[PDB]
């Protein structure tokens, strides 16, 4: 990660797919016919 000194002080040295959340409420979100 880095080194330690006396002078210094530890100096170092495809878009995702978004994930949505619903619920079964008709007619807000239902499976379709034939899911």
Not at 1 to 25: C, H, M, S
């Amino acid at each position: 990660i880095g080194y330690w000194n006396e002078d210094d002080k530890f100096v170092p040295a495809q878009n995702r797919t978004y994930i949505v959340t619903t619920i079964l409420e008709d007619p807000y979100v239902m499976l379709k016919k034939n899911a």
